[PDB]
Paper text:
LonA belongs to the AAA+ (ATPases associated with various cellular activities) superfamily and contains an N-terminal domain (NTD), a middle ATPase domain with conserved Walker motifs for ATP hydrolysis, and a C-terminal protease domain (CTD) with a serine-lysine catalytic dyad in the active site. Substrate recognition of LonA is thought to be mediated by its NTD. Collectively, our results showed that the NTD of LonA selectively interacts with protein substrates via critical hydrophobic residues of its N-lobe, demonstrating that the NTD enables LonA to perform protein quality control by selectively interacting with proteins in damaged or unfolded states.
Based on the result, we also crystallized and solved the structure of the longer N-terminal fragment NN291. The structure of NN291, refined to 1.7 Å resolution, is very similar to that of NN206 except for a longer C-terminal helix by four more residues, that is, residues 207–210. Nonetheless, NN243 exhibited extra intense and poorly dispersed cross-peaks around 7.5–8.5 ppm along the proton dimension that is indicative of a highly disordered peptide segment, which most likely corresponds to the C-terminal extension of NN243. Together, our crystallographic and NMR analyses suggest that the NTD of MtaLonA forms a bilobal globular structure (residues 1–206) followed by a C-terminal flexible extension (residues 211–243). We further applied multidimensional heteronuclear NMR experiments to assign the observed cross-peaks in 1H–15N TROSY-HSQC spectrum of NN206 (BMRB code: 50697) and the NMR-derived secondary structure of NN206, based on the Chemical Shift Index, was highly similar to its solved X-ray structures.
Residue numbers in the entry: -1 to 210
């Protein structure tokens, strides 16, 4: 089973947040600011969930993907425009299913841990494959540029779940693609999916290089 938490929800217009990342979320909507205030009132805990359609201004629960993350609001400060900049530390995958009627989005959702890697030796091999593929991916990417610290961090990650999520964070993949990664709670399947996307992209980059 999984812990079930009742938290406010921030709907993300066109981004997917992965666990093991700390990122700024700029929110302009009143209901989103309300959700942040409510999360501050109860240990900073919040759910973040991508919208299916970035154009929806006041999403119903149904307008949001099922999978998101449970996070901690580490900081929230106003920018010069009304904008609230929220620093979110994403901690865990969440299946955010059961919403509560009210003046902002609030839901009960199941939060997932990682469990011990099951086939440990297979997972260790996939970790090595992922690190090698990621180095090539960044080296051959025509738009994405990581500094030495970001690359070092991926190479130096020994936690397979953190590795896969960090790669997925950096990679230029669509909302749908990152949602597919979020929903893979099985570690081996998640590692293989991320490896698969990297490998496909490496082949695509070679094709784009030829045709240009």
């Amino acid at each position: 089973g999984h812990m079930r938490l009742e938290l406010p929800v921030i709907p993300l217009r066109n981004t997917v947040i992965l666990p093991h990342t700390t990122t700024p979320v700029d929110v302009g909507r009143a209901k989103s600011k309300r959700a942040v205030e409510e999360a501050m009132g109860a240990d900073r805990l919040i759910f973040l969930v991508a919208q299916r359609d970035p154009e929806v201004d006041d999403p119903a629960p149904d307008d949001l993907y099922t999978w998101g993350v449970q996070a901690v609001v580490k900081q929230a400060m106003r920018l010069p425009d009304g904008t609230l900049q929220v620093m979110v530390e994403a901690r865990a995958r969440a299946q955010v299913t059961d919403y509560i009627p009210g003046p902002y989005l609030r839901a009960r959702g199941e939060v997932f841990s990682e469990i011990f890697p099951i086939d440990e030796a297979v997972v260790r091999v996939l970790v090595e494959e992922l690190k090698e593929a990621f180095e090539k991916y960044v080296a051959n990417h025509k738009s994405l540029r990581l500094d030495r610290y970001q690359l070092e961090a991926v190479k130096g990650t020994s936690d397979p779940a953190m590795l896969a999520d960090t790669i997925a964070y950096h990679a230029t993949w669509t909302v749908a693609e990152k949602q597919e990664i979020l929903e893979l709670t099985d570690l081996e399947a998640r590692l293989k999916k991320v490896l698969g996307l990297l490998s496909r992209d490496l082949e695509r980059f070679e094709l784009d290089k030829r045709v240009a």
